[PDB]
Write a protein that binds this DNA or RNA. Structure first.
Lengths: 94, 90
DNA sequence: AGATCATGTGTGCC
DNA sequence: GGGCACACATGATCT
């Protein structure tokens, strides 16, 4: 556990910490609600903190999960409406 | 710089660290690709998910979902136009 | 070795 | 006479 060796942890662990920061920033940058903002932290006029990015990430996913429910509902409504038109048209002469 | 206010600074930092871990765990819990796994870290609540894994997956899963909406949009357009084209018959 | 996560610190902004 | 985020540098553990 010499002087060479503690410099080798503080190389490894610094990387762990900017590795986390960059993943947090990448996540911020695909969320259109917060993508443009500057950050409280070193990635490598309001500053976004790690908590807020992580909170918004969860909300932004609920939003996309919601939208998928709405899309699978929209689809069913439209397929349903196509069905009723095809029936009405098939059975009018009858 | 003193025993009682040392003590307090840590009390604080522990809470900050558990807030970040709980937020990461929530982000995990909403991503069905990873939601039911174990965690490498303490939440304030056989191999364990790590922080960066949850972060990478959250980005993977948001791209997936954004990409699917484009497919959903197309499915909707194809249907709306199939309706257009039945109704112009009357 | 190398990654990871937990613990104390010191710093700087509100 | 305060809390906060964040960075840093260690210690402990696991592959």
């Amino acid at each position: 556990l010499t002087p060479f060796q503690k410099q080798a942890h503080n190389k490894i662990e610094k990387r762990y910490r900017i590795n986390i920061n960059t993943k947090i920033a990448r996540l911020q940058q695909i969320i259109p609600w917060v993508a443009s903002e500057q950050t409280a932290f070193e990635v490598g006029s309001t500053k976004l903190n790690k908590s807020m990015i992580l909170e918004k990430a969860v909300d932004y996913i609920l939003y996309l999960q919601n939208n998928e429910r709405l899309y699978e509902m929209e689809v069913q409504r439209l397929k349903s409406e196509i069905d009723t038109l095809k029936q009405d048209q098939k059975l009018e002469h009858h």
